[PDB]
């Protein structure tokens, strides 16, 4: 069967300002099949109660989901998104970079 690996972007809702509440987003897109596991991490550990959009798809039929949580960025704290999918031999970790 044809499979399509997820594109992954980790980013904030608003420009990052240390000490100011924001939203941390992980956008997964362009993937098939629809089954996917997405974690948001703070300093390597899973953030609890992360919410996600309802499954939808693009014109080429590939799926997309938004995973999101409230966060307050600082200088030291490291954030990431961890994604698992059938197309991946191991889970893919993408670090949050405030300049992307």
């Amino acid at each position: 069967m044809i499979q399509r690996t997820p594109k992954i972007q980790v980013y904030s809702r608003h420009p990052a300002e240390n000490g100011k509440s924001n939203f941390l987003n992980c956008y997964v897109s362009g993937f098939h099949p629809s089954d996917i596991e997405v974690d948001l991490l703070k300093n390597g550990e899973r953030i609890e109660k992360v919410e996600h959009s309802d499954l939808s798809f693009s014109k080429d039929w590939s799926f997309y989901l938004l995973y999101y949580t409230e966060f307050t960025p600082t200088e030291k704290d490291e954030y990431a998104c961890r994604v698992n999918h059938v197309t991946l031999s191991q889970p893919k970790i993408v670090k949050w970079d405030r300049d992307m």
Binding site: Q9, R13, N25, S29, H32, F57, W61, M100
Partner: protein, 276 residues
């Protein structure tokens, strides 16, 4: 300007883990307004936009009935497709459907859509004429024969030209505060040194609605298509979208580069430069 309404549907089988999961969402342009998930505790179609909440109990009753019927029909279709493709009952498979309509500024139908995919591949689509079918393979041809026999295209045409346009018009009026407002991108350029020899120039577009946008880099007025990293347009989570375009530039050449931004929220396209 022009507008669209779409209903998206996905059924995913899961042998050994109960019945296929059914998720459907509705959109006007890039705004989600209704959702239904068969795995919800008490499945009902639920509003996701303020302007649809005013619809009465009978609206929600009819919608929920349709969603439940669709989930059921999809289950039977998934079984059928196993036969069509000579597949075992053991694996997970996917069925997707989207139909809807586009209308012009005057509210006239520009075109209608109704189209299905199986396991992520095109299966059968109603043509633009709203009267004939494109079947992807010999399996879809079996569906095509059945649908031609039952005059399915005629039924779809009636819905797409009628209700679909009329209810879209209604939604556009009820949600005129938001659906008929374009939010222009907030734009800026950032500079990211890579080495002594080069730096990244990144052109940002933030806080825009709808999602459609063009971000390009030029060098000496020449488009840098093959040298531009262009990320997919992504949701901010507040209805708006974000996008950036980046180029690797040689030291001292920054001012030869210009970022160009087109968005329907902008009266004129923008030109941006790195401002140290």
């Amino acid at each position: 300007g022009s507008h669209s309404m779409r209903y998206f549907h996905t059924s995913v089988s899961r042998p050994g883990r109960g019945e296929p999961r059914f998720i459907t969402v509705g959109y006007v342009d890039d705004t989600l307004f209704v959702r239904f998930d068969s795995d919800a505790a008490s499945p009902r179609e639920e509003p996701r936009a303020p302007w649809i909440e005013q619809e009465g109990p009978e609206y929600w009753d009819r919608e929920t009935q349709i969603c439940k019927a669709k989930a059921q029909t999809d289950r039977e279709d998934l079984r059928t497709l196993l036969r069509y493709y000579n597949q075992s009952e053991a694996g997970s498979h996917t069925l997707q459907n989207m139909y809807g309509c586009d209308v012009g500024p005057d509210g006239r139908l520009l075109r209608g859509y109704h189209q299905d995919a199986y396991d992520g591949k095109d299966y059968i689509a109603l043509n633009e004429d709203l009267s004939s079918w494109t079947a992807a393979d010999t399996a879809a041809q079996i569906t095509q024969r059945k649908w031609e026999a039952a005059r399915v295209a005629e039924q779809l045409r009636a819905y797409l030209e009628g209700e679909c346009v009329e209810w879209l018009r209604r939604y556009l009026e009820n949600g005129k505060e938001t659906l008929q407002r374009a939010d222009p991108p907030k734009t800026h350029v950032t500079h990211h040194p890579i080495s002594d020899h080069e730096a990244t120039l990144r052109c940002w577009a933030l806080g825009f609605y709808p999602a459609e946008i063009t971000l390009t880099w030029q060098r000496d007025g020449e488009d840098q298509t093959q040298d531009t990293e262009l990320v997919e347009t992504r949701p901010a989570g507040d209805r708006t979208f974000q996008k950036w375009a980046a180029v690797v530039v040689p030291s001292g050449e920054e001012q030869r580069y210009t970022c160009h931004v087109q968005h329907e929220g902008l009266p004129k396209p923008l030109t941006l430069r790195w401002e140290p």
